[PDB]
Ligand SMILES: CC1=C(CC(=O)O)c2cc(F)ccc2/C1=C\c1ccc(C(C)C)cc1
Ligand SMILES: CC1=C(CC(=O)O)c2cc(F)ccc2/C1=C\c1ccc(C(C)C)cc1
């Protein structure tokens with residue numbers, strides 16, 4: 001019964017996300033209504049950034065949080081090979097080519113979280129302010145840890161546009177469901193069809 | 199006839215914890231009832247099992263929308279999901295699916311109520327959707343198209359008998375399927391089902407988490 | 412300049428559409444605002460219904476109004492083969508198998524036109540009324556021309572759902588543009604690039 | 610900068626009747642303005658012609674949005690098209706593209722106004738969008754990424770010099786590109802450009818024919 005395992009895995013993944021956001025300086029100081037808005041609008045891009053960076057070691061595939069490998073062949077077989085190739089070329093391979101470390105990933109995700117354009121925010125300017133403090137911190141990090149790379153800071157920020165559009169395509173083409181859910185749903189339905197019935 | 203409209207009506211009437219799992223359970227529970235309904239449809243179980251899976255994956259969205267749309271005739275300005283939850287227009291706009299919510303009331307619930315669509319007619323329309331010969335991967339689309347023909351053969355017969363003064367009632371019923379098709383597509387992209395039965399469990403889980411240690 | 416010829420052809424095709432709608436009984440009697448709304452909401456499905464029926468004679472392709480033949484090999488090459496095949500299997504081929512005549516097409520297109528679900532109608536019930544008069548007329552036609560096919564009438568109406576979904580996928584995936592505009596736009600832009608510099 | 614002179618980028622920035630064909634001609638002319646601008650961008654013409662076409666097809670949508678968004682800094686509740694026509698919020702709502710219109714004002718025009726984005730800074734951001742190394746089919750994506758690197762190197766130098774009191778202005782400029790990317794995708798599926806410059810010519814053409822004999 002893989003379905004039950006994946007729903008439980010997601011709840012752990014969701015738990016980790018909120019805990020991660022609480023450790024971000026000043027996030028909890030925002031109005032609780034604003035905290036929920038930011039997680040509602042950002043969880044999609046925050047996950048894509050995570051397993052993209054986690055998949056630097058992988059070749060032609062993405063490594064999900066459950067240790068599950070997914071190769072681009074399994075993706076094309078599921079009819080979502082176009083989006084899958086965008087993850088590899090625009091995120092995974094670019095993250096690998098520049099050797100984006102875990103501090104730079106965390107900063108980019110905090111920037112994504114502090115999205116002042118999110119609809120319904122009670123204090124967008126405070127969100128914008130926390131955004132500024134994050135990337136001002138990221139710039140300092142890049143200057144001192146990579147002094148020879150004067151453009152690393154902008155290079156990092158200029159991967160957020162590719163993350164924005166990829167996040168939208170995943171929601172539109174049901175990328176998450178069709179990567180793992182195509183076959184288990186056939187198995188899941190067959191079980192119900194053979195069950196006892198009156 | 200060969201597709202007894204009585205057998206179609208009998209099938210219609212015979213049907214804190216981690217929040218994502220709670221949503222999976224509700225979705226699993228609602229899918230199973232849809233399978234038990236489809237197996238009470240005449241001749242459906244006689245199809246190849248692989249084709250039964252195809253027809254379900256292809257129609258599960260529209261079949262559920264048809265269910266709670268006709269179920270919401272009694273309630274007003276809201277939809278009654280199978281879980282007993284009474285979801286209203288404001289509860290859906292907060293979840294970001296306000297546009298779809300109004301289309302369900304305007305194009306399905308309200309039109310169902312005006313013409314007083316009985317549960318026998320509902321069952322036929324859902325059987326027609328179930329027997330969709332356009333579903334991709336069908337081993338023999340012709341026998342699916344044949345079964346569909348038997349359903350709307352019986353439905354027309356049922357309509358001309360139960361409502362003789364309304365000769366065009368039969369066509370009127372079929373002409374709600376385009377709207378049901380369009381609405382079905384919007385529910386997937388907006389995660390309509392996920393959000394309605396899960397918007398509050400998620401907000402509840404979040405609110406508790408953001409205040410927890 | 413093939414691009415310019417397409418815009419002329421569109422003006423003609425649009426003119427033909429408005430005249431067609433004015434010949435429909437009682438259409439012009441509707442409020443002019445409602446006439447525009449119904450043409451705003453229906454032109455997409457009305458065009459798809461036309462060239463799908465126009466393509467009955469074609470094999471593995473669709474015939475556009477400008478006589479331009481498009482084969483599926485060119486559509487799949489343009490990255491829209493999925494939608495293209497849906498036109499063929501769900502519309503063109505089905506029109507062929509049942510030998511849908513031009514009278515049945517006109518009735519179906521008029522039913523699509525009189526769409527009571529169109530947003531902003533002044534009198535939705537009046538449009539629904541004209542809709543009832545059309546398909547009641549279509550039923551009589553089917554009974555006389557194909558009495559041995561008692562379900563022909565419903566069979567026709569049950570292509571409208573497929574036409575609805577195919578109409579939505581064409582707009583979101585820009586099926587019209589990508590069908591032909593892959594090569595002309597390259598030439599169109601290349602012509603702009605080889606213009607004088609400075 | 611030495612390799613990507615920020616001065617050349619600012620120079621480039623400053624440098625009835627048939628309704629469909631009327632729109633095509635207007636779109637044709639507006640597209641050509643974008644091409645002439647792109648050719649005056651240093652090193653773009655040095656690229657293979659096939660790559661130049663790829664970058665134009667890939668960025669034309671966002672490049673136009675960035676253009677008329679900055680030009681609408683002065684006006685309020687509307688956008689100022691290149692033709693001088695003042696389109697208002699409700700005029701876009703009439704076309705059914707009211708949600709996109711508000712996003713342009715809130716996420717682009719308003720933000721551009723608050724930070725007093727000058728035309729030099731705009732030109733650089735558009736040059737960054739132009740040099741998109743993610744565009745599919747490029748013969749040498751590396752040189753495109755190099756050209757993009759030169760641009761935002763110059764912009765950062767320009768920003769640290771022209772606004773020394775705003776150390777975070779450079780990142781503030783780049784962090785509008787995600788919104789520009791998101792909004793650009795929504796304009797395509799809604800036919801945003803077609804409608805604004807064509808909404809009225811169609812109603813004019815429709816109204817006159819529905820009244821005509
Ligand atoms: C993309 C994705 C990741 C990757 C990550 O976040 O590292 C993950 C990790 C988890 F632990 C659980 C689920 C997921 C997941 C998608 C998903 C897929 C199907 C479902 C339902 C429909 C069962 C729910 C979610
Ligand atoms: C449907 C949905 C909403 C509601 C909305 O966004 O309209 C939401 C809001 C949040 F704040 C967080 C998650 C979600 C969410 C689904 C979800 C998706 C993946 C996961 C795991 C894999 C981390 C867990 C949950």
Ligand SMILES: CC1=C(CC(=O)O)c2cc(F)ccc2/C1=C\c1ccc(C(C)C)cc1
Pocket residue numbers: 003174177181185222223225226227229254255256258259386
């Ligand atoms: C058949 C099917 C599709 C494909 C489609 O209809 O286009 C889909 C797309 C989605 F995004 C989510 C679910 C589904 C789905 C069935 C399903 C139903 C219950 C569940 C729960 C029990 C975990 C999981 C999956």
Ligand SMILES: CC1=C(CC(=O)O)c2cc(F)ccc2/C1=C\c1ccc(C(C)C)cc1
Pocket residue numbers: 417418419420421422423424458461462474475476477587588592
């Ligand atoms: C599908 C289609 C037909 C077929 C028909 O309607 O029978 C047609 C006939 C005409 F005369 C003109 C255009 C079209 C057309 C699509 C189209 C394609 C590109 C464009 C712009 C982007 C230039 C605009 C429209």
Ligand SMILES: CC1=C(CC(=O)O)c2cc(F)ccc2/C1=C\c1ccc(C(C)C)cc1
Pocket residue numbers: 420421422424425428447450451452454458629704705800803804811815
């Ligand atoms: C964008 C657009 C609208 C407005 C909308 O749909 O929001 C509209 C409303 C109408 F009544 C008629 C045409 C159109 C139209 C474009 C169009 C232009 C040429 C053609 C030819 C090829 C038949 C077909 C369609």
Ligand SMILES: CC1=C(CC(=O)O)c2cc(F)ccc2/C1=C\c1ccc(C(C)C)cc1
Pocket residue numbers: 414585588596633634636637640665666667669670797
């Ligand atoms: C490059 C390009 C794309 C591809 C994309 O951006 O994804 C597109 C998509 C559309 F839907 C419409 C137009 C276009 C387009 C250019 C174009 C520009 C002027 C014209 C008029 C003058 C006939 C016709 C076409």
